[PDB]
Design a protein around this ligand. Structure first.
Ligand SMILES: N#Cc1c(NC(=O)c2cc(S(=O)(=O)N3CCOCC3)c(Cl)cc2Cl)sc2c1CCCC2
Length: 454
């Protein structure tokens, strides 16, 4: 990073002083103590557990200073009213100091997100950084900003939303030079009411943009009432300014033609939507000085993006929600608070399969028990646990939940009831159920998700 502790303190409105501390140039920002290095800035957030607990473990790992809502003593600390707010203001300031061009994209997808594609095309001419994984919310975006390599010219930021107004905040924080909305109306769409509202929240991606900035929005009418007034708006889709005039899909390949492009394009993936993503990403890449040739070559060696947590279905008509990455307690807690917000389907049955999260440290077991506060008997009908460190949590669940609503399957270097787990899961899994699957990845967890799909 390119910041110093007094700088940060000044930018954040430190309630303490800082003059008392060294005022040393910092290395990088981390909210995961387990990630801190020598000279890093520690940012304690409210997660599975409060981050403030880990402050000490932070300096032990190298922290040179720490944000904090309370006096730290005998340690360099910047005192603020709220650490997340402080973290966001700081990311915002870093954007102003850097003057990097920001490209906001909203709407993940699956195989190859617009975010990765666009970042990929920009990489052909510029030093470009992007949102890693799914770090696209009020914690992830700020984080992505601060981890931007020195000299970045193009920053592609993906922005997700759980509640209306989430994107408005992100737009205001990042101030995108250009923005893209891919949209689609969610089904059981938890926390959100209906398509129009999802579209309303996504169109907020424009709120923090300067007048005349380019914004790509789909042809779908669902966004009409939310269009910005003083922006350069380009519509994509059949009939719109930008459109796919021809498409061909192989078994694992794709070839399509975009009206504004004179040549065709090839992608190592299959999907009408991937084509559109590629197209809209191309348009923005073009506006930034990238040639159709450079673009054409780049799509030659794209790069698939490991599934991307979303719904799917097991040969049964089930609603499988397998959260792939982010194997940490906060992520689990969050995936739980969401999965348990989505009301049940037809019949109305809710199931969650939780497994061990490796590498949590000597605090692993305690961290798994913490999930108990995120498990409600009323909303979840069956919770199945698979592992070792998660056993104490299963025991807690068996006491808190009704008789018979919990299951536990062993998994150690001695024994592994993977056999019985699949058997049990398959048995409980009804054709109109929603099964949540979360836990560090493993050969078995993968086989299990497959026994459902097959
Ligand atoms: N409590 C807690 C812990 C962690 N929490 C997170 O790493 C964390 C994760 C997320 S996230 O994974 O859900 N989020 C990220 C960036 O944005 C997208 C997803 C968000 Cl929000 C906040 C946070 Cl504090 S890691 C870890 C512990 C306990 C001790 C052992 C290691």
């Amino acid at each position: 990073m390119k910041l110093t502790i007094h700088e940060i303190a000044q930018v954040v409105g430190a309630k303490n002083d800082i003059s008392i501390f060294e005022d040393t140039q910092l290395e990088k920002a981390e909210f995961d103590s387990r990630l801190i290095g020598t000279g890093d800035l520690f940012v304690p957030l409210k997660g599975a557990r409060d981050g403030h607990d880990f402050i000490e473990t932070a300096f032990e790992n190298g922290a040179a200073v720490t944000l904090s809502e309370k006096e730290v003593s005998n340690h360099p600390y910047i005192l603020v009213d709220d650490v997340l707010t402080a973290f966001q203001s700081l990311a915002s300031y870093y954007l102003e100091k850097t003057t990097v061009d920001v490209f906001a994209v909203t709407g993940s997808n699956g195989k190859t997100t617009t975010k990765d594609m666009l970042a990929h095309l920009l990489s052909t001419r510029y030093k470009t950084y992007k949102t890693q994984g799914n770090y696209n919310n009020e914690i992830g975006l700020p984080y992505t900003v601060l981890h931007m390599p020195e000299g970045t010219e193009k920053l592609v930021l993906e922005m997700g939303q759980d509640h209306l107004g989430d994107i408005h905040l992100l737009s205001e924080l990042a101030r995108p030079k250009t923005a893209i909305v891919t949209l689609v109306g969610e089904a059981h769409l938890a926390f959100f009411k209906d398509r129009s509202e999802i579209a309303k929240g996504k169109m907020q991606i424009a709120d923090g943009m300067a007048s005349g900035s380019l914004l790509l929005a789909p042809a779908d009418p669902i966004v009409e009432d939310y269009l910005p007034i003083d922006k350069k708006v380009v519509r994509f889709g059949q009939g719109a300014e930008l459109e796919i005039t021809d498409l061909v899909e192989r078994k694992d390949s794709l070839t399509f033609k975009a009206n504004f492009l004179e040549q065709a394009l090839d992608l190592p993936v299959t999907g009408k939507y991937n084509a559109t993503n590629a197209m809209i990403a191309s348009y923005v890449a073009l506006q930034e000085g990238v040639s159709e040739e450079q673009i054409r070559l780049a799509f030659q060696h794209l790069e698939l993006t490991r599934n991307r947590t979303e719904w799917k279905k097991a040969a049964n008509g089930a609603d499988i929600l397998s959260d792939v990455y982010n194997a940490n307690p906060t992520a689990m807690k969050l995936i739980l608070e969401t999965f348990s917000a989505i009301p049940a389907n037809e019949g109305g049955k809710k199931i969650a399969v939780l497994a061990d999260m490796k590498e949590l440290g000597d605090q692993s077991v305690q961290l798994h028990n913490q999930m108990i506060l995120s498990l409600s008997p009323d909303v979840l009908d069956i919770v199945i646990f698979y592992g070792e460190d998660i056993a104490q949590l299963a025991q807690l669940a068996s006491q808190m939940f009704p008789i018979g609503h919990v299951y536990y399957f062993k998994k150690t270097e001695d024994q592994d009831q993977f056999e019985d787990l699949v058997k049990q899961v398959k048995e409980s899994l009804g054709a109109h159920d929603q099964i949540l699957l979360k836990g560090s990845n493993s050969m078995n967890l993968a086989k299990l998700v497959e026994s459902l799909e097959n």
